[PDB]
Write a protein that binds this DNA or RNA. Sequence first.
RNA 1: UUCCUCGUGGCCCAAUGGUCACGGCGUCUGGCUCGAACCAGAAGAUUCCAGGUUCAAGUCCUGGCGGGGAAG
Length: 606
Amino acid sequence: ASTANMISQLKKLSIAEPAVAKDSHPDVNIVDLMRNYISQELSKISGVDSSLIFPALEWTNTMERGDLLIPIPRLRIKGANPKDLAVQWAEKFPCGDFLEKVEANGPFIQFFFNPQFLAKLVIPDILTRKEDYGSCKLVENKKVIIEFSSPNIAKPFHAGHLRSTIIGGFLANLYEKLGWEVIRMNYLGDWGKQFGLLAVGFERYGNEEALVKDPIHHLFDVYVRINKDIEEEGDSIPLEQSTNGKAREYFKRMEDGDEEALKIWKRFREFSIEKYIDTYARLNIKYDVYSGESQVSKESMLKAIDLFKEKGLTHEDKGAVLIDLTKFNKKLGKAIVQKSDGTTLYLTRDVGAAMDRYEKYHFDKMIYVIASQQDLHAAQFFEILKQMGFEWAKDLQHVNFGMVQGMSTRKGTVVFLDNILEETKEKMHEVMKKNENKYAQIEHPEEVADLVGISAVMIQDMQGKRINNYEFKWERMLSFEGDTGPYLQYAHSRLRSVERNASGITQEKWINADFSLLKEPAAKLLIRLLGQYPDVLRNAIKTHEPTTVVTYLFKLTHQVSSCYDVLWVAGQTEELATARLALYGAARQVLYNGMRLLGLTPVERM
RNA sequence: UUCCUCGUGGCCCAAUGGUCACGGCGUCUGGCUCGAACCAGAAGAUUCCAGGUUCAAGUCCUGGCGGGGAAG
């Protein structure tokens, strides 16, 4: 046997334990292949079980320290001296065609993959599976429900709601790529005093004809004014006669039955959902079901109430049903689940909704993409499902995120998301016209500008970890130089130009290129880069951070761009021209994959 | 007042507990006779403070300070 054989032995090798081996996928992750190899070999040298070595292998910070490394201390070898072991094991390590070099360094052992070896396997793999390159089957017939955005249709959809939307869109695409069935659910906040306020407000300032001219502009004007009332008349006018109370009243009429209200409501409900469907689509998102606070009946809600008692979780307080979660967690406190008047509160509705979902979908996992401002709530909610004894309770997860600051209707700082997009599109359109020759070759400058701007908007948000807050600033959405959406778009766009620029050669020929011709440092760094996308995605699903992907995407595009200035595809020998076309080709495919994963839309020209 | 969360270069920000902290912006020097929305090079750090756990801390623990959030 030999090299093509070692690969087989390594692909059908579960050196990892029943737990971690479910992570080893030598077949679709070059780094895993190496993890296997390195483990098998280092075991033969060290005497240490390979299952102990595998998880001790770490991907490096920068590509200067190798492709993987292992901290000897981690192996916990009694009385040993890591620095010596490193040296010993390192100088004796079999490189073969896999590794380029193994070098001891302090208590660590670094492993430098052989770029040639990588090239021959990764590019073809990438060029062949294309949109499925990063893919990996991490789950066996599992269904997940991801509830995201879930806005209150009675309030302006501003820049702040961009977050729960794109994050949820991301997790959805990510989960699918790793083998999950995904239900994209928008849990619309469409049943309460808030809508009441909007309805009342429409009587006060609404104008049926202006509504038709531009529903949204008018409705916003309505929202604005009616809200000035609640503010201006603070604690004066007695409830029944005040605006606020008048709003609560309108909701009563609905929750009561008033066929008159349930009509103006349903009218709004249908319309809003239509307006939303376009917006989400403009962000490459298509919900499977548009649920909502309304969709959870008093049946499901009360059935839950009984369960709280049935399990001895509630206590009576002057007619109100409460739940003191202290027993379970001091920080959780007490929660009102139903008030004296009988009205079940939102904490109870959420539990209803939950149970309803488990019944209808029998999901293996449900992800709640809410904002950090609902941390306590989310926690209580989860705790309750636990103590209710639901098996699935343990399959619920809350993915939070920081807030976009600088959005206030009463401060006039408010700016709708549809407009943020639009305004950015126009700006991107102008920079696009700065280059006549090129601009001329674009068929739909408008469509493309909007794609470019959206990438700008999305990336600037996904660059840092969800948890981080950030100040709304137009310059954040309008920048195109440096690490910005436009940067990725331009890289993708120029890699395509290079392709078109050499139609003379086609993909089929790329896969069988003489990869040995990709020996330059720049090409090596880029090759190594290419084989990490698979690890990136799997790590992405652990951190649930768009930034996990975006960070990679820039290292990739950065390296690509470096290469772009030294490795020409044009004016070369057909042999070298095909070699680099396969390199840039794969690079483009990976960038394509990642961008889509994040929810952006690659552009061919800009 | 109680709880949570963030604090990394002048500004934004990354990091599996694993070595001498990744990028962008600003700024300095260069490069337009397959896309310069770019590239090459330079300078800028003790990762908020006092400690602690650990072979190893930006990362974990306690407390302080500051911003944000939540509860009362």
